[PDB]
Design a protein around this ligand. Structure first.
Ligand SMILES: [Zn+2]
Lengths: 149, 98, 129, 24, 139
RNA sequence: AAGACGAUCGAACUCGGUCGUUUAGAGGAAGUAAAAGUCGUAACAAGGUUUCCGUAGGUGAACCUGCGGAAGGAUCAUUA
RNA sequence: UAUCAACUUUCGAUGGUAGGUCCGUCGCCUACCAUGGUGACCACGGGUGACGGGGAAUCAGGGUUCGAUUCCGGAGAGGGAGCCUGAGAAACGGCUACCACAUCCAAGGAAGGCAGCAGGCGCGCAAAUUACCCAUUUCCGACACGGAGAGGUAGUGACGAAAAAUAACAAUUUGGAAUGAGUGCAUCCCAAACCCAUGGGCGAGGACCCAUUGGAGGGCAAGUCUGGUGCCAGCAGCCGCGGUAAUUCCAGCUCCAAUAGCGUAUGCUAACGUUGCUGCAGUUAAAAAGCUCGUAGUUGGAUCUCUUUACUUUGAAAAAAUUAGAGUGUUCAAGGCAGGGCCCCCCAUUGAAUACCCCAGCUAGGAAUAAUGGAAUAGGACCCCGGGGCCAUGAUCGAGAGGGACGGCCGGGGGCAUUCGUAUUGCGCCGCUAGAGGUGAAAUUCUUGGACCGGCGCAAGACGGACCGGAGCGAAAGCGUUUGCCAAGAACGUUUUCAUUAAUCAAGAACGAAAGUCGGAGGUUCGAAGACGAUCAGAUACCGUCGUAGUUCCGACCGUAAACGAUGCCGACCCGCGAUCCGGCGGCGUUUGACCCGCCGGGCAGCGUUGCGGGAAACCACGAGUCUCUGGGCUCCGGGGGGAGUAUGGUUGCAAAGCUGAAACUUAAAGGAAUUGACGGAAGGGCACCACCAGGAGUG
């Protein structure tokens, strides 16, 4: 079931048994890298990178053609930020919630959701610290996070 | 012991419903627990509709009806003989009486 | 959310056996589950199960022969020596004539009679009779 | 009515506090 | 449900440790109470001096004057009510003499139709009351 | 050798602080066990004002009432 | 034991340097420096009817309880403190003081420590002889010799344990026949004596040389036996027995588990799966925190010949006694570690063993399970010879786990601002009239100062009907007039993205209906309180008029509800059907998305079968199923009913009160579900001139 939500919904991707590339794909291993590079520099998260490639260029699994996924490709070159984009949107949501609370004070449901957003941030950062992907001194502060968006 | 599976109301998936007022006693009754009764009766009685018909200055005028939406509490819906106390197996019949 | 794959495996087998089914589908597969089924199949409690070789946890479809009474797990996997193995036999098996306790010795997954012949104990997984 | 056993109990506890307060 | 984890020996031990206190027979034997309030102080018998001869009335639906005696203990000076068990043995009770009282059946509980008497006299004047009832040890 | 300065160990005593523990107390207010004596009928059948919870106020007394609940209700149901 | 949460150092608390000190190490102490050490994995503090252990009792297993007590170790010698001597004592059957207690004095002084052996007092429910001797066992010294209340022996002893009388063989009551217990001599025994044991002798027929103790209603083996006692006296652990035919009590006989033992009281064990690790319960019987967040703790998806841990096996170690237990006819047995047989050999120079000894540490394997870990800016593994070469050169995923993006949405989710609808109430005008309000009835009250009623209006404050449903949303409380603004959320869609980042969660926190509380606004209606009207024997109520607080809004509190699905969260598995909600998918059609037929995924529910299960049953597929065939993970919580959610302590609060939370004492039931009767001032149906209708007689 969901982490901080009820319901046990089942909506995810299912990779087929085919660990190969369809023959009707004319994009080589280097042409897809240029597509990721030209779009990541335009201000598009890696989550948005695979979407446009899947829906316009017809990509299936870069992990099959290339020995690495999109994450290990942009990091080997140096085009992806340090903190992952997943935690980036977790902090962005809290900024809108904080700004919403500053104008509306008696919205108890919005304040209740604020704790859930921060709870996922600390649980995720706790995994970030033990994986050495974030600095051990990294700490989310609600006062200084407004400029991180 | 639990007398009814629905506890005598139509609250499924909710925690609280809007309470409404009764008619003959003015008691706060929940909306789902109220004894609905849509009364639709003529303005003039059938025993007096003929006197009004011949006194009508027109040729054919249909007399309107009194559309009244009544709400009864459990203690009054039984005293007013709107609902009765049915048998243990008869209570499960949710079909309206003919 | 699972905390055990052998528990949900033997629970699916135990239910499908009592419901009169002939084959049961086990959603997660693992080498501990496969070697557990081999101990039951070697003694004549299940048929020839087929491991659905997927690039995931893997599934197993076991052929039920109805010869099984109940298969269950002992969570947690307690450390059972040879001096106290006689105690678990009176608490999990119906009688001294049939029924086996699946132990995990250092030589691999086996039953309680094989572990006594090999003269070695280990962690207990479950039982079947 | 068990609620009025709680009404009389809160009424007796409130009197015991006033008796204990004047002994300060 | 109960925690079965392999490293839950502390959680299981502390839980059973605090839940045993909810047992009436365990909490009365493992606390200061029920031992200092017990007139015998954890003893099976006790000596005392007969202070009064009071006849307590049995409870409904019975009707009979239970013959007991108000006895003050010598070991701690507490005053209890020992019940004269046999018939007519209240006349054998002397005034201001030593009597060896003991428990009355149920431990710390009134027995039978007697309202609150939970003690009975065994010996009277350094001799058994049973002998005084059976024509022995004329005293 | 007696004896003395100083150091050190330190019993013990006179006053305090604190902790544990054991007890007196005018008087006050409860609980339980008696007889159930008076008063009224609160509840149990529509208990004759449906019961009950939380909360508050009020009332010889059980209780009454408001507000929001709950059915453990006397309704599993009331019609285009 | 948390009603002990932080603790330790202005005198060492932690560590650093040097030194002192002691046999020696060390904050053991001194001095200079650091601000440390311990702690929710329970420190610290307190309590203990706490000496620890070997062990004892009870136990199917798991356990529970006990261990002052003869062995080992420690501690102490009235309470402490400080010493002498000696190799070894902070010794007390050695000293020096003080404290407590106490003895002899001639009143100057002196001398005291039985928690050594006997004994006394006291204390108590509770526990022996001022007994005999160094022989065994051994110990101490100058030692063959001497010393030992250490010890040995005996007395007392129903702690307890092992053997074992009160007949037997006969007859239809009498014959002997067999034997001690007891009672009197030798011997043996013993260091002497003593209990025995043995040799003969003296020794039982109501073999009077005699067995009692609780019982005889049930539980629970045994009498409607006999007589009186009559809710009195009593019996009874429990339920219960007596109110003039008591199977219970007050007695006899008889009978019964009995038995040299047997009752009673109390502790404790099993019974008790009523403490549940094995192994209990939490819908309604005692019970899941109102709801969610959250660390420690606990448990964690699949994936590797079929770096170090945890785990299993082996051996030494893991005192003796005890226990288990091989061996041995102490006449047997409890026990003992000792002996049957052939004229100095013979269980082959008669014994003889072993297991267990948890945990931890130690010793020698295995590599399953579960962690951990070697290469990603390669300071990479190897070979070269600090430059190259070399490797298959180093990243498993893509969970019927989750986060987030993204698309179309969806919904009473929430905040705020507007629009609208009336109605109630208040006021003005216009119009006609005397009652009107209200009630079962009445009255209060409003009324020719025009009430009530009808119209045109006006103003203020609540509320947001019918649509609205066993439909949606949210963690819950809760949420439905229009429009606008604001930032969320499930589900679904996905060959996107991240890649185990989890689940449950003491401590901690957000929210939390209503009432209440503090501070403003507004107060229509309702309406605690309150007045008054009615009813009653009495209403301090229901009913009626009126109305404060309150109800409405604004902020800070309060954190309580039958906050209920009286049902924790997560996960797997386990029936069917028809609907319904959102999204997705593919199919005749109708209609410019709507409707139709399905399907996949969650959501609220329903019906049917539960007679594939569960339960005491009612009832349960939002399982309350997969539970003696008992073990998926985790949190909270219950232990007969009362006392009592009381007292006290801590703590929160403005207060009311919230959280935490007892005991004494009392009690044999309380309670759950179901059933048959009765009853209802419940419903339905039916019946009779002892009911009426229609009348006719007569009574009053
Ligand atoms: Zn109503």
């Amino acid at each position: 079931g969901r982490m901080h939500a009820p319901g046990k919904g089942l909506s995810q991707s299912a990779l087929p048994y085919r660990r190969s590339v369809p023959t009707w794909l004319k994009l080589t291993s280097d042409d897809v890298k240029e597509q990721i590079f030209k779009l990541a520099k335009k201000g598009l998260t890696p989550s948005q990178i695979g979407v446009i490639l899947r829906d316009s260029h017809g990509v299936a699994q870069v992990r099959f053609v290339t020995g690495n996924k999109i994450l290990r490709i942009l990091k080997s070159k140096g085009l992806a930020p340090d903190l992952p984009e997943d935690l980036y949107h977790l902090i962005k949501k809290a900024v809108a919630v904080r700004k919403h609370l500053e104008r509306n004070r008696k919205d108890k449901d919005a304040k209740f959701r604020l704790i859930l957003v921060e709870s996922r941030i600390h649980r995720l950062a706790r995994y970030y610290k033990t994986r050495r992907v974030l600095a051990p001194n990294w700490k989310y502060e609600s006062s200084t996070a407004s400029a991180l968006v | 012991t639990k007398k009814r599976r629905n506890n005598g109301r139509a609250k499924k998936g909710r925690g609280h419903v809007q309470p409404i007022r009764c008619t003959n006693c003015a008691r706060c009754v929940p909306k789902d627990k109220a004894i609905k009764k849509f009364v639709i009766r003529n303005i003039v009685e059938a025993a007096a509709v003929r006197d009004i018909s011949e006194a009508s200055v027109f040729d054919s005028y249909v007399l309107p009806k009194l559309y009244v939406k009544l709400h009864y509490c459990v203690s009054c819906a039984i005293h007013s003989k709107v609902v009765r106390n049915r048998s243990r197996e008869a209570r499960k019949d949710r079909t309206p009486p003919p | 959310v699972r905390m055990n794959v052998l528990a949900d495996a033997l629970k699916s087998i135990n239910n499908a056996e009592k419901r009169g089914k002939r084959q049961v589908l086990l959603r997660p597969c693992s080498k501990v589950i496969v070697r557990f089924l081999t101990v039951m199949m070697k003694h004549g409690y299940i048929g020839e199960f087929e491991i659905i070789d997927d690039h995931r946890a893997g599934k197993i479809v076991v052929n039920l022969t109805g010869r099984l009474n109940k298969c269950g797990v002992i969570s947690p996997r307690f450390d059972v020596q040879l001096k106290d193995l006689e105690k678990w036999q009176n608490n999990l098996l119906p009688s001294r004539q049939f029924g086996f306790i699946v132990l995990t010795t250092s030589a691999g997954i086996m039953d309680h009679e094989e572990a006594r012949r090999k003269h070695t104990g280990g962690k207990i997984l479950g039982f079947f009779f | 009515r068990a609620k009025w056993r709680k009404k009389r109990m809160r009424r007796l506890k409130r009197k015991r506090r006033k008796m204990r307060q004047r002994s300060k | 449900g109960k925690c079965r984890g392999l490293r839950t020996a502390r959680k299981l031990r502390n839980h059973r440790r605090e839940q045993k206190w909810h047992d009436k027979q365990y909490k009365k034997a493992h606390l200061g109470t029920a031992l200092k309030a017990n007139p015998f102080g954890g003893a099976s018998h006790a000596k005392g001096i007969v202070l009064e001869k009071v006849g307590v009335e049995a409870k409904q639906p019975n009707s009979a004057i239970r013959k007991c005696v108000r006895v003050q203990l010598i070991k701690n000076g507490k005053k209890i009510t020992a019940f004269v068990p046999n018939d007519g043995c209240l006349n054998f009770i002397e005034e201001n003499d030593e009597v060896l009282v003991a428990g009355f059946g149920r431990k710390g509980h009134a027995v039978g139709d007697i309202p609150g008497v939970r003690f009975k006299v065994v010996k009277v004047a350094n001799v058994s009351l049973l002998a005084l009832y059976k024509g022995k040890k004329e005293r």
